[model samples]
Target: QELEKKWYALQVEPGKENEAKENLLKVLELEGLKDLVDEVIVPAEEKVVIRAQGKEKYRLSLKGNARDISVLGKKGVTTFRIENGEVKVVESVEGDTCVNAPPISKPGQKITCKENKTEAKIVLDNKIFPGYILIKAHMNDKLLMAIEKTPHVFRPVMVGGKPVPLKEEEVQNILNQIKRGVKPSKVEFEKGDQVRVIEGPFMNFTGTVEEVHPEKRKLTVMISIFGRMTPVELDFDQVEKI
Candidate 1:
């Protein structure tokens, strides 16, 4: 009656879920309480999501045997989903798949792949970023799989849980803000506009714009130097219009 009144929930480190199951069973057996313990259960589920990149192609396995399937050759592009007692393919394209990779900084990070590489930053609410690299592929998955398998990267910024496929546009929008770094403006700078130097040797000095270079994000300002008017070249960020 006392055993019936109790329940057990253990917090195990990730990837150790199965190991915890085995250890729990072994403990019950060791303590001669196997008969008292009716059952052991683990709670977890996997889901797949489709993105707006059109309908994705997948290599379906009508049979339930994984060893007999050819889908295991590639890594990230093709993922498996359990359905009706069969593991089916849930993917973006016939021979390709898109997956998100996290902790997207380089210099300290190493990425090795067979396909062409392009990187992007991940931003949140137009400000904070987690980190990730946007990789495009045709038949490439090994590189993505490698990154996903690495510690901390196992969680690849997705809408759902394991064995999941999430929208590419949703994730891309988060990264796009990084590319559009500057705020929008009607007229950034112009001649005859009053400006102040926020940086360089002339910091805090106020001046009138003598020239503007929109392409270079720079401006020439005329300021009083030793009581004589002088023109100084400055970066756009260094000045604010009055």
Candidate 2:
């Protein structure tokens, strides 16, 4: 009837993909052009990472989220817990909280603070595809302007100064991947290889692959713990080859 939607890519500042994706939606709605859009997608994956910004271990800066007061110099901050890569804000502590202090807490570890609200948040570092963002929409002048003017945008990927639409197969392949990039995959590992745990309670532990389960992408690895050799079950993505 009117026009067909095709996926187009955008160039953005690295690490600012989310900001551009989110702001464009508001801009589209405000400009009464949201109807032309079918979907806005970012290819991202999540993993645990610790960071501390204060001068001391006891003091952490607020992210301007939760109860942190601006004028008081990082005041009224609280503790947070990461569950399955979700950052959950726990109850506020009294004196201070721990940020970036780590011995490599793994994905399954549920760490809680005891006393003195540390005024902290745990950032789950979700990886975006560097500087590219994808949008599926019908090509239109106003829609192009809305995206080109969005924050963090350099421009839409183009050929001969016109936005290029991706093939139907490319769009299908990308949609399939964006939902499934979180875990272990075949290219990342194989049987009987040296590897190191990157996160979880066993972070930094070196081991050899004892078994690889292709179905679940899980692994059993032989590692040394304390004085004994132990076999630990791990997600394939949790370890990097040594």
Clashes of each: 5, 11
lDDT of 2 at 2: 69
Error of 2 at 51 (Å): 9.6
TM-score of 1: 0.28
Question: Compared with the true structure, what per-residue lDDT tens digits does model 2 show for residues 1-242?
Answer: 76788888888888777777788888898889899998876655333332223333432221223332121123444455544334444434454343434422323333333343222333324344678888888878998888888888777898999999888788677656644535644456677898889989999888889888888888999986753778999997798898
TM-score for every candidate vs. truth?
0.28, 0.46
Across 39-71, the per-residue lDDT of candidate 1 in tens digits comes to 433332221221122232332222233321113
Residue 34 shift from truth in candidate 1, angstroms: 47
Best by TM-score: 2
For candidate 1, list the clashing residue pairs, or say none.
56-92, 57-92, 77-97, 104-131, 104-132
Candidate 2, which segments miss by more than 4 Å at Cα?
1-4, 46-128, 175-242
Give the winner by lDDT.
2
